[PDB]
Amino acid sequence: ERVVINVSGLRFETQLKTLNQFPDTLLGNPQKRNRYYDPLRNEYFFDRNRPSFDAILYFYQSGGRLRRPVNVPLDVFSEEIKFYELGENAFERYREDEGF
Amino acid sequence: ERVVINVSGLRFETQLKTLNQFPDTLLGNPQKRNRYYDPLRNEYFFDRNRPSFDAILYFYQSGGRLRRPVNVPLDVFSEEIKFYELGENAFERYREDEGF
Amino acid sequence: ERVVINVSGLRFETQLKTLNQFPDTLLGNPQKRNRYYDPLRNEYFFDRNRPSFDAILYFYQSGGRLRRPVNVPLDVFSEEIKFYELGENAFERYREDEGF
Amino acid sequence: ERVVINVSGLRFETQLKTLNQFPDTLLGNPQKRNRYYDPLRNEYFFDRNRPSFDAILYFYQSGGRLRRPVNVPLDVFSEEIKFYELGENAFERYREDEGF
Question: Which residues form the BTB domain (chains A, B, C, D) (predicted)?
Fold first, then answer.
């Protein structure tokens, strides 16, 4: 099943299975992701930072690799990983990787 | 209400409420933004630099965080923040952040 | 008149007047740009490098500012400015700006 | 013949001839690329990293120039060139270019 995630007009596509492998995240939990469903467009809409999302989707595609894009600052990216609820395990890895 | 902002073919989407929170800017003022409405496509069209716009929309989404993308030079970005009329408060913060 | 330039699937939009201000370039010369018209899609198609094009269109929008994106290497960008026939005046400025 | 390659929602377009010049790669071999055909959308779908793909398509357009985008880390890019089966000749050049 193909899913369309619209981040501020930038459309990402993936399979439901890709998101569902991390069920304790916003996009992996139907109950949380469905709060963001747009019934008019059959998409999930986020009125959020666009350049961070490459990395949020790749976290799922890669089975857990969390990497901040260089064109996106630390604090911006930190707020997005928290919003998408990637988990304390992933936040720990990220924190070691950047210093703090 | 969903808004489509077409910057040189790159389409951004946001909510009207997101833009309207900064009413003393081009995109937050209906009177100014409507000069750029494209009645054929039901979008606002800007024939302008594309890579700067991520940051112009995120200024609204973040409630005021103004950040220059690294792939975009200082002078290019400076001209865009002036064009979008982000305000002297925001221009001051930006100026401290980059030197000048 | 709105123009759609499809660079390898990345669609850029501008006005004809924007391109026509530099008539001695590929995109500013109807005779040269029309070799790339796609009658099925009513677009100009280039099966070329995508990240360089932001900067090729901005050269026209800015009235002549030629800048290489940082995510695009020198030799890649040099080949694109030559292909788009931006002119020896612009190529000189670029050459000073990068060394050689 | 125009081909649409959908990488996680980012659509790339090229000509079949462009891909077919490197027949010993995934995208240059009909038998391998067709495993990824999406009959509902008449596209080839890859649920993969988006920022690396500029460079994978440009490898074909340029007749062999393989370059890692700067916004994409070494290990991420290395996994994509292996997946797309660009060849040991190209992997050797890449390895010299980055160290290892």
Answer: 1-95
Technique of determination: X-ray
Q: Which residues contact A42 (CB under 8 A, 6 or more apart)?
A: A4
CA B39 from centroid of its chain's CA atoms:
20
Expressed in Å, this structure's resolution amounts to 1.5
> Cβ distance B10 to C11 under 8 Å?
no
**What residues contact residue C87 under an 8 Å CB cut-off, 6+ apart?**
C22, C24, C25
- Say which DSSP state A93 is in: H
What's the structural domain count of chain A?
A: 1
Domain span holding position A100: 1-100
Residue A91 per-residue DSSP state = H
How far lies B96's CA from each of B66, B81, C34, in Å? Answer: 12, 15, 47
Helix (H), strand (E) at residue C10: strand C10-15
CATH number at residue B47: 3.30.710.10
Rounded to a whole number, what is the distance in Å from the CA of A99 to chain B's nearest CA? 21
How many CA atoms, within 13 angstroms, populate the side-chain half-sphere of residue D60?
Answer: 28
The rounded distance, in Å, linking the Cα atoms of C65 and C58 is 7
D32 and D85 in contact (C-beta within 8 Å)? yes
Interface test with A, best of B50, B58, B97 (most A CBs within 10 A): B58
Take residue A1 and report the two structure tokens written for it.
């099943």
- Tokens 């026209």 appear where? C60
Nearest CA in chain A to D8: A13
The CA distances from residue B15 to B21, B27, C80, in Å, are 11, 12, 37
User: Quick one: DSSP state of residue C14?
Assistant: E
For B5, phi and psi rounded to 5 degrees? -110, 110
Contact B76 C58 (CB under 8 A): yes
Residue A45 contacts by C-beta under 8 Å, 6 or more apart in sequence? A6, A36, A37, A38, B13
Are β-strands B43-46 and B2-7 bridged in parallel, bridged antiparallel, or unpaired? Answer: parallel
